[PDB]
Amino acid sequence: MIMISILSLLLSTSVTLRRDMSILFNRISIIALAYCILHDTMSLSFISKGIGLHGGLLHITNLTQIFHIFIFIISILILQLTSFYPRKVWIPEYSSLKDIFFNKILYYRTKIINKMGEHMKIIEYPLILLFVISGAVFLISTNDLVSIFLSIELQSYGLYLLSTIYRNSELSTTGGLIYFLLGGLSSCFILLGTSLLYVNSGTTSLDGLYILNSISDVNSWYKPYYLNFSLLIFSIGFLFKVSAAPFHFWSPDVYDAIPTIVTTFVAIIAKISIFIFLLELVYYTNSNANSYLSEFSWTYALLISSLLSLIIGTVVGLTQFRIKRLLAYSTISHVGFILLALSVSSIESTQAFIFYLIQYSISNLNAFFILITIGFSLYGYVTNNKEYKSLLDKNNSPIQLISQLKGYFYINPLLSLSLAITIFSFVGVPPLVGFFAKQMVLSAALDNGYIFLSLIAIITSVIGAVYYLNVIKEIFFYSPEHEVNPVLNESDSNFSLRILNEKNVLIRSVLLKGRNIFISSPFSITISIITNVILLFIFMNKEWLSMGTILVQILFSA
């Protein structure tokens, strides 16, 4: 379905150069990803560790299918930014069902809705995003060494093109260029990792290597040293892409350089797909019996990375004044928690790893939505700060600084509370969902003897809570540097809106001002749902937590 959707969308895209089509090509892509959800939902009625598909090259697991569907929902939610206009005009005279379904509202919307904005004029943008999803989902399903390499490339190359699709931005071309170059270094490590596996073992099957590994677990000419340190090189190439330290340096720069609607999808999807792929590898390569092979486990990179990602993520985030550089360092400290749960391989830690990855991906997406919405709200607001005048590419990243958020609770209080709840959920404060995620990973690590990493993580969090609180301190504790626009609210300049009925006949003409201009519903509803999921998780935790209890039971059974 995703492949039919790419080919069909590409044929329609290839016979048009009309930039007005970008909004409708994005709306059709959301319809396409909804069919993919209906198909992977139908495929969920089997209990199995894995079923080889297509000549052994691909596999399907309950974990593989629940993760494709999650990627599809997340993609539908990110695709909304390019599918609907940011702003809106709302009047009580146009607010009933008969009004919405049988009346029309005519007015000059070109400036109010930013019809000709850059996010609304890239025809191929949904198409390149579908290719990244195609690569992401194929990687979760990869069962061969060759399949892994092609799938990570199909995911990576599209992220390079998305990072560069704003071609008139010197900031995106630079972010795109850094990411392509250093990710190409990352892939050369991944190719070396796979190449050493096939060269020492004669097989491209992951299923064959897991069998060789399980026999070699006993308790003289061909000791299987290659598996642990071929997998080590293979692993470093994936720690670059999830931006786990000490391979993290690119992500603050790239995420800060590319536009914010783009940094939303590029900073979230690669992690879900890569972490799920590594989970099956870590389970099937663990030597239950202590052995010489155990002393050299490739998974110690993951602990070293999780250790480093905790210190690096929270400390370097202390003196970040740029909101996108802050969001990326917050991610490097959260991937440390993810890595720690991935390195302790146990039922409790696999439940914790699965819960943490889904909740952080919805929470980091809320953070991006609030950020994007806050910088679309500043349309009827004006500032006189020299710093806010000296910024670069203000159209692609409307909010670039933490200080730009100073006094936002006095401009829009509920959106500021929504960002407070999301940030407090990154801290790990109860009874929010992020606390429960952090507690589940601490409980698993404490049970399995990783007492030292648990102590690092708790001390690390208080350090990271410092810069999270400086964000909230900026929202709540000072006064706005932004002022209502004096001419958009002047009581002398008002545009005319006119309400017609089902057949091109006028009903009522209205005169409207800037106070009649609001955020479009698709973004306020999306922020509202994720905020309330985060807020009220304690009353709605049973089905979500049980979904992860069962997947772990299937993976560790038999």
Partner: protein, 88 residues
């Protein structure tokens, strides 16, 4: 043995390069070449056509990477005006 020697040239020609980004993008092409060579030489030793098949698919994606690279490099040059990498 030429596999390691070639792989080390492309790794340092990528990391120790202080000239320009096309030479950056060239050194990736060298590393992939050395890995393909290791895979091609092993496959002849193990009577495996799969290794040659794997090699051919690393050539096709290595060309896809170099086209995406040269395309991104042009975009960057149009705006920056130099693809020279600057030290001091």
């Amino acid at each position: 043995n030429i596999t390691l020697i070639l792989f080390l040239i492309g790794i340092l020609g990528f990391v120790l390069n202080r000239k320009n980004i096309i030479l950056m993008l060239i050194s990736i092409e060298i590393m992939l070449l050395s890995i393909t060579f290791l895979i091609l030489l092993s496959s002849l030793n193990m009577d495996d056509i799969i290794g040659q098949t794997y090699a051919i698919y690393i050539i096709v994606v290595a060309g896809a990477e170099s086209a995406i690279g040269l395309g991104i490099l042009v975009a960057f040059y149009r705006l920056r005006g130099s693809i020279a990498i600057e030290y001091k």
